[PDB]
Design a protein around this ligand. Structure first.
Ligand SMILES: [Mg+2]
Ligand SMILES: [Mg+2]
Ligand SMILES: [Mg+2]
Ligand SMILES: [Mg+2]
Ligand SMILES: [Mg+2]
Ligand SMILES: [Mg+2]
Ligand SMILES: [Mg+2]
Ligand SMILES: [Mg+2]
Ligand SMILES: [Mg+2]
Ligand SMILES: [Mg+2]
Ligand SMILES: [Mg+2]
Ligand SMILES: [Mg+2]
Ligand SMILES: [Mg+2]
Ligand SMILES: [Mg+2]
Ligand SMILES: [Mg+2]
Ligand SMILES: [Mg+2]
Ligand SMILES: [Mg+2]
Ligand SMILES: [Mg+2]
Ligand SMILES: [Mg+2]
Ligand SMILES: [Mg+2]
Ligand SMILES: [Mg+2]
Ligand SMILES: [Mg+2]
Ligand SMILES: [Mg+2]
Ligand SMILES: [Zn+2]
Ligand SMILES: [Zn+2]
Lengths: 72, 101, 97, 79, 124, 55
RNA sequence: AGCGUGUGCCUACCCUACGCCGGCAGGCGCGGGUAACCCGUUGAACCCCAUUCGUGAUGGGGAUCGGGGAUUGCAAUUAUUCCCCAUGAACGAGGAAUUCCCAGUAAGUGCGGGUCAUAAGCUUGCGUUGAUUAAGUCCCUGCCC
RNA sequence: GGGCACCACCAGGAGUGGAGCCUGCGGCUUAAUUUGACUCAACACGGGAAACCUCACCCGGCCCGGACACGGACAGGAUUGACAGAUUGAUA
């Protein structure tokens, strides 16, 4: 027997393309003229994600991308 | 002085009987008390298969067979003399097991 | 193939320590028996050894279900330069004990 | 625990068959003739019969020192 | 005229727990419930309940589709629209009170009934 | 995720949980005495294993 | 009775004695066996001795269906298998044609192994009961000199 | 023109071909009802007793397990995974 093609489905299921963001570190910190630094993003309460691993400021929740911890 | 049992397992009878005779002679040369060798019933493993790698032709079968023979020897003696006589006993194809009951 | 760098480090360290490698050709095996407590899947070992083979660093044999890999001289040099090992370290194979 | 005598003898035969196949594939180039396994409670010795032993040994004995390694890795009995 | 399942009407069935319903069912359904339901069946139940809650007071609930042909029909499913996969299409089934204790796959047939044609040359 | 779905189907019994120890074929398998070979591989290696034809 | 199997590299899945519960399929405990050691003195079926039936598609036969219960599995519906009540079809020895077989044989009757989580109307072996006919030919079929 | 054979006959036994059912093979249906084999020397044969796997057929959806070499892009980030809501047969 020979293989039939039958090439017809939903036109194209596209693959997710990751967003390109330039200098994402900067928006985590706010700066005053005096030289102070304030951390805009919350720090996760988990063990590993404690100091430099910031959370996600979603419109209705806080989300840590490293351990899937979520808060209201 | 221990009651020591030697179990000999083999696939061919000539080597097994040669080893048993060697052990008996060696032990009796030391003026020891030997019982046996007592021969257990022979075991016969059988595998029946089809000859053809496919399912075509006359239905012919191969009958493969393996035979296992077993001997027992009893000795009233200390451990050291048994190991003395056993060291020589090493033979290709014969499994020798020494136990103290 | 994508894998954490520590898995590659462990595989290469084991290979350079022993000089040989054995695998079972089982992509679904949760972890390599030899690489225990380091959590290296068997698939990672297979693919890393394949990558080494394609570059000529290891020689390969296959028997009845198993992969056997031996380390080549250029593979020895590559592993020594990769792991930053001193020139006074050789695999256990190269020692006539 | 332990296994029965039937399983023990079948396992020994299967081990010998696999060892022979591996040695055949490895040493066909060297005129590999056969393998003889002598089991002793101290060590299990393997005798390789081939037309020329120089290629099997290798330089300074490297190649054979490799083989006795992978065998130990394959069947798992201790170093 | 009023529906009763082994002498029990629908309201009492809806009030009963799973342990009480085990004794009403037959041996197969009782054994299945004793072995427990897994995550997928609970998800299907949750989706059916959510769909039935949002129905208008005089309208039918939205059809919920599923591949679970071995799902047992519980008394809480009566009155829901379920599309059951038969391997090719989702067949729409409305759960009636007399379906309690059957499987979902018993109501979506997996083959086309045979209408025979003229036998060919190779038949003797 | 994919990690859960991939190879999730249980394989603790059946033809899918057993294969030949030489060629990884699941058909015509011999399990007696723990051989775990297909019939063709067994016929190929019987003399090496130690099965002799006497009848 | 006899031949055999039994706790498995991956690999999860063994054979079961005894006590109690259930009417049965089964469920609980608690032991032995890696085996001439435990299942096991393998209390097998046909066969044998009594009882009922009485030439009636009959108490022969057991297909097809209804309602219940239990086990294997992740999952039993298009019924996995098993058990219990109920239902009770054709079939009264088979046309033309055609198969196998010469002594512990043919046939009857059970029991192991393979497949096997669940598992035999198949196959491969083993016993038990045990014959009629023949010690010839080239007529049919076929193959050689 | 001879010789031989119970996969030939003769003298027989048990039969099969008839019934119900179980299983293979054709047909006919189907989205698919995967496929090999057709006189002995195909048809309870492929050790083929398939609920899933087996699986090779149909419907739908993930994954790369595309080595290595060259070029591009890249620590001002090449790429990886994921909570909620939507979506989905599905907690892909
Ligand atoms: Mg009647
Ligand atoms: Mg009757
Ligand atoms: Mg019923
Ligand atoms: Mg069907
Ligand atoms: Mg009845
Ligand atoms: Mg004829
Ligand atoms: Mg039988
Ligand atoms: Mg069976
Ligand atoms: Mg069959
Ligand atoms: Mg003639
Ligand atoms: Mg006649
Ligand atoms: Mg008959
Ligand atoms: Mg007849
Ligand atoms: Mg008939
Ligand atoms: Mg036909
Ligand atoms: Mg095909
Ligand atoms: Mg012929
Ligand atoms: Mg077929
Ligand atoms: Mg079946
Ligand atoms: Mg199903
Ligand atoms: Mg599936
Ligand atoms: Mg299938
Ligand atoms: Mg990728
Ligand atoms: Zn965190
Ligand atoms: Zn094979």
């Amino acid at each position: 027997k020979k293989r039939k093609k039958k090439s017809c489905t939903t036109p194209k299921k596209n693959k997710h393309k990751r967003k390109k963001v330039k200098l994402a570190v900067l928006k985590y910190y706010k700066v005053d003229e005096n030289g102070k630094i304030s951390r805009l993003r919350r720090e996760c309460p988990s063990d590993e994600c404690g100091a430099g691993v910031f959370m996600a400021s979603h419109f209705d929740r806080h989300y840590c991308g490293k351990c899937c911890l979520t808060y209201c | 002085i221990h009651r020591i049992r030697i179990t000999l397992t083999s696939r061919n009878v000539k080597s097994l009987e040669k080893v048993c005779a060697d052990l008996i002679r060696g032990a009796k040369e030391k003026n020891l008390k030997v019982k046996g060798p007592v021969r257990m019933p022979t075991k016969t493993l059988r595998i029946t298969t089809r000859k053809t790698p496919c399912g075509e032709g006359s239905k012919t079968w191969d009958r493969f067979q393996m035979r296992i023979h077993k001997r027992l020897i009893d000795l009233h003696s200390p451990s050291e003399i048994v190991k003395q006589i056993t060291s020589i006993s090493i033979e290709p194809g014969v499994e020798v097991e020494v136990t103290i009951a | 193939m994508l894998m954490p760098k520590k898995n590659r480090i462990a595989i290469y360290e084991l290979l350079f320590k022993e000089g040989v490698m054995v695998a079972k050709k089982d992509v679904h095996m949760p972890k390599h028996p030899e690489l225990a407590d380091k959590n290296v899947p068997n698939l990672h070992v297979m693919k890393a050894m394949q990558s080494l083979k394609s570059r000529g660093y290891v020689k390969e044999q296959f028997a009845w279900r198993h992969f056997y890999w031996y380390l080549t001289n250029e593979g020895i040099q590559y592993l020594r330069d990769y792991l930053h090992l001193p020139p006074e370290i050789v695999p256990a194979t190269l020692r006539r004990s | 625990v332990q296994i029965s005598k039937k399983r023990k003898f079948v396992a020994d035969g299967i081990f010998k068959a696999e060892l022979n196949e591996f040695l055949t594939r490895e040493l066909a180039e060297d005129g590999y003739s056969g393998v003889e396994v002598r089991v002793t409670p101290t060590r299990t010795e393997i005798i390789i019969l081939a037309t020329r032993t120089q290629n099997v040994l290798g330089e300074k004995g490297r190649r054979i020192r490799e083989l006795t390694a992978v065998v130990q890795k394959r069947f798992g009995f201790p170093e | 005229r009023k529906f009763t399942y082994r002498g029990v009407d629908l309201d009492q069935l809806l009030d009963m727990s799973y342990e009480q319903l085990m004794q009403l069912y037959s041996a197969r359904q009782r054994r299945r419930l004793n072995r427990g339901l897994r995550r997928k069946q609970h998800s299907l139940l949750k989706r059916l309940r959510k769909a039935k809650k949002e129905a208008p007071p005089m309208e039918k609930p939205e059809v919920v589709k599923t591949h679970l042909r071995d799902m047992i029909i519980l008394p809480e499913m009566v009155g829901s629209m379920v599309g059951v996969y038969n391997g090719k299409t989702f067949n729409q089934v409305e759960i009636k009170p007399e379906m309690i204790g059957h499987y979902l796959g018993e109501f979506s047939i997996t083959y086309k009934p045979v209408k025979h044609g003229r036998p060919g040359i190779g038949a003797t | 995720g994919h990690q859960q779905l991939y190879w999730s189907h249980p394989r603790k019994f059946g033809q899918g949980s057993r294969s030949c120890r030489v060629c990884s074929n699941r058909h015509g398998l011999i399990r007696k005495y723990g051989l775990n070979m297909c019939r063709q591989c067994f016929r190929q290696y019987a003399k090496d294993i130690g099965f002799i034809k006497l009848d």
